[PDB]
Design a protein around this ligand. Sequence first.
Ligand SMILES: CN(C(=O)c1cc2c(C(=O)N3CCCC3)[nH]nc2cc1O)c1ccc(N2CCOCC2)cc1
Ligand SMILES: CN(C(=O)c1cc2c(C(=O)N3CCCC3)[nH]nc2cc1O)c1ccc(N2CCOCC2)cc1
Lengths: 209, 209
Amino acid sequence: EVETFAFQAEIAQLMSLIINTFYSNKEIFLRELISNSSDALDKIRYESLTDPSKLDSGKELHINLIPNKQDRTLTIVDTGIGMTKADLINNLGTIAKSGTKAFMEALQAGADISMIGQFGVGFYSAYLVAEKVTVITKHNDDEQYAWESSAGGSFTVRTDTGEPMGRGTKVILHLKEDQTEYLEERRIKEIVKKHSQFIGYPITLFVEK
Amino acid sequence: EVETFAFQAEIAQLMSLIINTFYSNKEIFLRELISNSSDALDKIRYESLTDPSKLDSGKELHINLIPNKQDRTLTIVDTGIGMTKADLINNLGTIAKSGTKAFMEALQAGADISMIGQFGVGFYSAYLVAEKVTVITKHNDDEQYAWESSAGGSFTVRTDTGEPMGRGTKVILHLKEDQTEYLEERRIKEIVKKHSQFIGYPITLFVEK
Ligand SMILES: CN(C(=O)c1cc2c(C(=O)N3CCCC3)[nH]nc2cc1O)c1ccc(N2CCOCC2)cc1
Ligand SMILES: CN(C(=O)c1cc2c(C(=O)N3CCCC3)[nH]nc2cc1O)c1ccc(N2CCOCC2)cc1
């Protein structure tokens, strides 16, 4: 039912560095996640040019930002290409290996944590603000999956029996208690305007009722 | 034999802006092209994880920089995924439309030409230094092609009967007379160190004999 995996050694080391380093410029996590969503959307958009049937699972290409004060969660939803079971368990970790090692070498040489995206491992900056990250994903060629990690060197992958999402990725950030500023509408708008002004897909902020 | 196509209106406008604007920070073209090569290499590397036969056309994943003082050309060769005929004629132009329009709107609003890559149209910065650009490409699923443009609103595409390259893309920059500094070893090294220090593939500079 639920399978548990160890992160690649380099990724586990990067996650501990992120979780334990005193670093006040935490807002970069949102830019990194939106950039990842933009990449997934670019991929499905490109693939649909030669195979329009790839859009049968949904034609709208967008990003939704969903803060939830009551649950203390910030959700980033996109209708990109999504990820396969192989992506979640191995492919993405394999690809991230050289960038993770290079990033850690750069930090040692005095680089700033904000440079994380230049190494293709921006996702892990989510651990600056989140105690747990849950990722629900659906690729055309595979089942709907739930990936999850509270760091500590492991992650889980299971088939997701929850609401179907058609195609794409939903990243659910379970925020740390001192990081609730990222649930504020004005704060999210400020971050998006500063870092993500130039993304080629509509970014919609869902206002809480 | 040789087919001639018009650039999409927005791209033709961007090219004229690039060719006609007084802008001294021309070195960004090399960073933009190396970033494009890195993207192509990421794609083949990722695809090879689920289908290792995609590497039958070549296992080495790298970038070569080849200045040629005698021909006044700077060649950037990569062994990435390469491009199909559809990529050259339509797909890449289609995708670049929103980014090109957005980039031009940003320039109007005072943005710097160096921001070109943030709009996914970095390739066109090649026209800061080149009077003509020739692109030889080979994707696993297609024939070897030669794309070429001296701007002026048109480009050509033909099947290439020249040396086979296995898989990848070769960008040949026919430099403007006042832009020969980009053929100098020290100058290329300076640019690569400043802008491309963090690329996940070997970048080899070929020294002229
Ligand atoms: C296909 N795909 C996605 O569906 C997707 C993944 C996301 C992640 C993420 O990175 N992970 C979530 C689980 C663990 C790793 N964060 N937000 C995401 C939004 C998405 O739509 C995807 C997009 C981008 C990238 N990367 C970009 C940087 O360079 C390396 C590849 C890899 C996959
Ligand atoms: C698959 N592929 C390539 O084989 C390749 C293309 C290159 C270009 C280029 O852009 N063009 C050459 C002909 C006309 C347009 N310049 N140097 C390149 C090196 C390459 O290996 C490729 C790589 C990157 C991208 N883009 C990145 C930015 O975002 C939009 C997509 C699109 C295709």
